Design a protein around this ligand. Structure first.
Ligand SMILES: O=S(=O)(O)c1cc(S(=O)(=O)O)c2ccc3c(S(=O)(=O)O)cc(S(=O)(=O)O)c4ccc1c2c43
Ligand SMILES: O=S(=O)(O)c1cc(S(=O)(=O)O)c2ccc3c(S(=O)(=O)O)cc(S(=O)(=O)O)c4ccc1c2c43
Ligand SMILES: [K+]
Ligand SMILES: [K+]
Ligand SMILES: [K+]
Ligand SMILES: [K+]
Ligand SMILES: [K+]
Ligand SMILES: [K+]
Ligand SMILES: [K+]
Ligand SMILES: [K+]
Lengths: 494, 492, 494, 492
């Protein structure tokens, strides 16, 4: 058990010789240059996030080229992620750029576009045309990061709601609105999204962080928008509200992974429930064998302070203990004053937590949830991990061209590094969001097709050896493929 | 497993009908009056902490008196905890009340008392006389909550160290110092502690939060300081540095429990290691069946803001997930602006965490670790909890005069409330640091010794009924006499 | 596991200080006298069987009185069992007392009573009137302990079957017949049975061994025949053919226990399948918590030889390993030359086997089959046994007036003696068919009602102590009751 | 559990499509001819036992020759086992060919050879020269299959014991004697054994059933007696007295397997203890992954009757339940009237027992006992069997040249047939004493070394298909190179 593992631990013992968790850094003006990106990579960045809420295609093109230049100069593979702006609900403009809302006061929110450019404290525009048919009397409208809270009293007409201002807040033009109780039916992907996504396809991005996913069918729209040429791009669904949490089973099934957006979830969901949601979503993904990212409000105070709060450190450690594959930095690296130091600290926290985490509890819990009879692929990968524990093997080598079996092996949480040997550089990059895995590129063009597998196996073994994971006389568990991996070897390291 | 449990949860599901975890509140200006304390109790306070780092005996007598009154007025039992100042290492005074220390500069720290009242940036006093024989070249000295860091280069003489100032910080007089690598050999209790501990025994305090505990032997010196009149007072050891952490097994053995003082540990140990040390110390106490408190910087930003940070909330939740019996408030209640709200929210987080927590993982993990043969008490308490799971009983009733068997049952973490029926009011108070237990007092001098146990058992079941834990047709596991008799009871 | 337990065993280790299995001896002319019965008891007899296939009421009255005299002289309680003659199918008489049946020959078997007293090799009587409507062409008729086998060719008329004699055998008058494939629908209890059973009720017998039980409804007929005054008499169902084996679940539910009649089952069922049937029936009873008796062909050769075959010893040991509560002797004690020596040897075999049997495998297998939530009685008894294993308690004491909780505790197979303290002498006798239990009579008339339970608990503890099971400083697990046992104590022996 | 499995069984359910247990048959007058042996093979014989207690080298050469011919004619592989006479203790001769021993009478047993040819009821010879220094007063001497029991009263001299005749029995010349309490120190191999063992190496026998094995050291003396030319011959140790039983761990360590010789054990040990010794020895071998044979008085009454007793049938079934790899026939086939019928029936009992037996209990019990870390071979073989259960595979294919990995897989008891593909015919023969395995021979000199393993794997799957074990869409677990490579294969 984890409890039994805790008794045996000492904080003055040396830490693990590898970090399993993976760090996603969002790129901005602090970090867009190749020297800044090289600093990031060396600090621990595995994944570069592009926030398409800001900047233009040219700005992001520069991120892409610079990431690739930085990775090539350091001899590594860094994933590139496109985070979509997504559909939004915003207020319109206000007469005088401003509207002083006062507690107890009554106001009117309109679907009528005529008021888009002349709102006041008394009556203003909201750009979601289905607003009235989705909201009922009693429901709440949150405006400006949920700072202003309105309660709906009644429908004045088909397009207008009578609202009570429940607290004093002064709002400006084009502020973002949230609908806590309501099933927002905005399209999955907007127009900008659809052109961003084709840009991403054209620039060969590795994954999509798809904003505001509330439904399984919405995952299909991101898929269709990515088109036939985008079929190999991973779709990571951002879970940001109650709907997404409620439909999580069907969303996970359709997507390639999940981001837990704690800050966004917290706008309508009490903080203590988001903590629990994080547990649920992470575990569901762990059992599905799909990467899961813990995001927003991670080491936030370290954007301008050289040091985070203790509660922040603890937040990051427990993300790892929950079982997150990935931890993500936002403003801390995009606009922050200490981009290198925040990534380095995050690597240190993850590594410390990993040294305390009992991987076997994960292995055993997930193995118990398998129904007998298992299919071959599932039996092979769980057996391989089992053999790691039984022989105390010190590494795994998995031959996987698409990364699929590498993810299936990682799902079972061996207590040793996984080395994936693959013939696709895109697999190396995409595996950067799966914990416990390091990828080795084997160049089938430069080296042959290695149909017997021996060269790839030696490449993985050699990598493991050069990182000090295995030495002469150690065990290494090898798995390989015809479609999936059906073959296992327990190899004595020479 | 916890992982398997997580799969089945829905955050919209209703929370449990009871909060197992317990809340300790530090009393200060914000909360010392009877009506404030009354607010605190109804908000969720189980233990009143008196911080003896400040305030006179007159001030804490006012806290003591006021707590007992507020509690009596509400007809409840509140524990009173005396949190000692403890031994300290401080700098001396400085010429001009101040000393501007600069990175790269060299300074001299002296054991020589002559410099106590005339320190400068170049040479100043430190009041720990064994400083030089404990510190080696390479070691660090932390000053002023570890903001100023000095590295020791060499011994200038027997009483003086040559130090490099490794960072720029301006310090004032009498600032606290820490020795990260070093086995500090300061005594267990200070001279002020002895006066304070004697005072606590006189005023009938329920427990001591004993500061800066580093070894098992030191627990006994605290014990000797309370005397024969104070032998039923619980000693909860505050663990604050690497020695306490290293010596934790033997310290847990001698103590009645442990406080994980994160902030003090954090002065000397990287924050990520403190997080792990919390996990270790909590689980060791769970297994020992002794109470553990998660203390310091729990909901700190709610001292002056009406809501805490999201990270602070997860910190509280994860202390519950770790297995803590108690969570503690300091300035949030002592000097804070929202004392009631902070306690009510702490209560709400705990309850939410508890609803997601799979108790059976705890029961089972702890069970798996018991050596066989078990002694009778161990066997009876673990069986009875096992019986709760196997018959899906909705309450336990534990007849315990000293609280011992109530603590032993609570150790095994049944997934239902534990009602302890006891003949000592002090037991009612002391069980307030044990999760999952509520106490009912049975006045044996007024009502008889109840040798057949019927009256005390009925008192327990009645309490459970009154609270909505059980109704007609439900099972209640009853344990009694240390305990060796178990009964599976159909509720009438 | 049992396998793991086998590794640790040594045959030169001393045996257990108690025998858990119980010995049933059938009384006959060899053993009917009070001195012979006293020899039996001292040899290990717990139960006296009366075979009502032979002898008259006066003969059996003498058995009853003598058993009671013998038990009273030795200060013990011995159960008395009435084994019913049961319904039978027999041939009629033959012209000349004899009929030479020859392989290949054709004969005719008739339901017509006119031929009852004048059968020949060509045509003879069978007294089961539903014979023709139960038998089909192809079916077999077994005659004279299955020595003569006939195959049915056709129905000559409504009352007559044309049969081929499939083997050469010479039969005499009134020989017993078996119908291997057929659902024999003879009444549960005959006329003799119904008058025997009322005799048994009148003489206060402890249990019925009900012959030829094939159906659950038949158990009800034994029950109705026992009448209102017989309600407390245990009905042990004898399983003797495929029907009884096929309906075993419903039979066990209705009865108070089961006898596995191996010899009888073997007439129509191949020997190797009866071995398996024994496993099935014993385990089903173990899980139901109802006594099960292994009977017939036990130490058979020891009827006239001073020593049994090795295969016989092995048969008896494996009955114990299967989990039988009881082993039964028939001719070996009824008509045998070595009645004392066969019981003594059987006690020795049982004791040796018990020393090799891992009780925990029984406890754990049965505990695993309980559905959560358990009812209180079930949770209490399994917990009590669990506590024996966890504290290595050396005895149990169970207060049980009807014996019901004593049987429920025994079901869970603690690895220590169970002491039942009861206020009914009939409970002491009836518990003689439950393994691992010894009974102590507490006389509520002579000693009071002991509503607080303390005296009965001391009586059980004292008994345990006087047999050397527990000494000062040992643990004893006490269970007691209001209906069932809801209360448990772990007591330190003074 | 086995108990839980029993609940689900129906005796009318069809038996398994394969018999895991193996049948050894002793050859004699009833069965020495090629057509008789042919009858035996088709009836279910896997091993031909030659009992060297009787018959000349010429007689057993006839058995050897005839077995190989019968097997070749049927296109199968049959193992040939040489069962040695071993060291013996016998009485001498008697005046008049006879000696009437009477209960209560006193007699004298002498080590002095002068009395070898003139013993009487009063004084007779015993040929074990260390008899007096091994026997103490109180000890028993068993004579003539333990029918005559003598108790030792005292030493009359250095070579002579005063004995009480404890029961009435008439003995003849050269009768066998047993020493129940005593550590018999007779040599491992007799002079006749050496001649016989050398003969077996010359004739290429597959295994030795080594008589009267008492200690681990004795296994090596048998080994040394076979020489370098006989190093691949398996030594199966016949355990026949208390020394073999006591020393079983170390004996199993040195041996290639164990025969539980019930009848010989029964001369000296009560029959109920022999039953338990069978359980112990069988389970120890299962755990060691070495073959164990249950031998002697298995279906003895079927020597002269057409059907056995019911107790004999349960005895055969329970040897299978115990975990025996093999069951053995002696006079039933050597001198019996129904050799074919006895083997066919033995086969039928085994198959019925196997159908009721839950293999998973074995797999799991043996698994639970493996120390961690496992060595690679152990890990690979146990995983692969685990894989059979988890994917419900219907066959295993094991590429094993020496048979080692085939024995290691068979140890873990998958619930499906094991096909061993091997390049040595001797391995085909030797695996006939390992349950659950069938062997396919791959002629590497004729077909190539098959370094890619494809041809041998296809040979295995093909065999499994031919036998009805697998069809299209079924899983087959393949293990190969000792073994370290596992493949879960979809059958085409
Ligand atoms: O003089 S100090 O340096 O403060 C000093 C040091 C140590 S030591 O360092 O731990 O050995 C003391 C140990 C034990 C003490 C006991 S005790 O009953 O034996 O526990 C009683 C008194 S009392 O106040 O006089 O009643 C003590 C006064 C002062 C003490 C110590 C006292
Ligand atoms: O003379 S005997 O009493 O029969 C006798 C007794 C013992 S002992 O009791 O076990 O020491 C023997 C031990 C080892 C022997 C070896 S070996 O190669 O060393 O194994 C070879 C021969 S050989 O037949 O001459 O080739 C032996 C002949 C006779 C032997 C022994 C021989
Ligand atoms: K975005
Ligand atoms: K770890
Ligand atoms: K303090
Ligand atoms: K819970
Ligand atoms: K009868
Ligand atoms: K036992
Ligand atoms: K022999
Ligand atoms: K089977």
């Amino acid at each position: 058990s984890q409890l039994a593992h805790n008794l045996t631990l000492s904080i003055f013992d040396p830490v693990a010789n590898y970090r399993a968790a993976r760090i996603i850094c969002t790129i901005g003006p602090s970090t867009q240059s190749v020297e800044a990106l090289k600093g990031l990579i060396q600090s621990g960045m595995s994944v570069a996030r592009m926030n398409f809420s800001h900047g233009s295609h040219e700005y992001h093109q520069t991120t892409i080229n610079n990431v690739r230049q930085a990775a090539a100069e350091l001899g590594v593979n860094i994933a590139i992620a496109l985070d979509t702006k997504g559909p939004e609900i915003r207020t319109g403009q206000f007469v005088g750029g401003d509207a002083v809302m006062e507690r107890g006061a009554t106001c009117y929110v309109t679907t009528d576009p005529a008021f888009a450019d002349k709102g006041t404290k008394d009556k203003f525009y909201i750009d979601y045309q289905n607003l009235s048919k989705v909201v009922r009397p009693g429901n709440y409208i949150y405006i400006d990061d949920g700072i202003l809270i309105l309660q709906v009293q009644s429908h004045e007409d088909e397009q207008t709601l009578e609202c009570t201002v429940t607290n004093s807040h002064t709002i400006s033009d084009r502020r973002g609105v949230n609908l806590p109780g309501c099933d927002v039916d905005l399209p999955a992907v907007s127009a900008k999204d659809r052109v961003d996504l084709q840009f991403g396809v054209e620039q060969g991005v590795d994954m999509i962080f798809a904003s505001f996913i509330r439904s399984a069918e919405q995952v299909g729209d991101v898929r269709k928008a990515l088109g036939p040429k985008g079929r190999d791009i991973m779709i990571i669904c951002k879970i940001e509200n109650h709907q997404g949490v409620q439909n999580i089973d069907s969303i996970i099934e359709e997507s390639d992974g999940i981001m837990v957006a704690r800050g966004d979830l917290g706008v309508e969901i009490p903080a203590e429930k988001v903590v629990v949601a994080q547990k649920i979503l992470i575990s569901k993904c762990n059992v599905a064998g799909k990467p899961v990212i813990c995001a927003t409000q991670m080491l936030e105070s370290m954007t301008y302070n050289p040091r985070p709060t203790r509660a922040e450190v603890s937040d990051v450690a427990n993300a790892v203990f929950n079982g997150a594959d990935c931890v993500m930095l936002s403003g801390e690296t995009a606009k922050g004053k200490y981009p290198n130091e925040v990534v380095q600290y995050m690597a240190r926290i993850c590594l410390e937590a990993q040294s305390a985490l009992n991987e076997y509890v994960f292995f055993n819990s997930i193995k118990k949830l398998q129904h007998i009879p298992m299919s071959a692929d599932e039996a092979v990968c769980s057996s391989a991990v089992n053999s790691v524990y039984e022989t105390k093997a010190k590494a795994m080598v998995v031959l996987s061209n698409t990364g699929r079996s590498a993810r299936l092996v990682a799902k079972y949480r061996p207590n040793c590094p996984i080395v994936c040997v693959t013939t696709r550089l895109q697999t190396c990059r995409q595996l950067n969001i799966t914990q416990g895995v390091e990828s080795v590129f084997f160049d089938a063009d430069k080296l042959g097709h290695d149909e017997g597998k021996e060269h790839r196996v030696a490449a993985g073994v050699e990598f493991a050896k050069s990182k000090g994971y295995v030495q002469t006389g150690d065990y290494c568990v090898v798995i390989h493929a015809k479609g999936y991996a059906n073959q296992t070897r327990i190899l004595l390291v020479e």
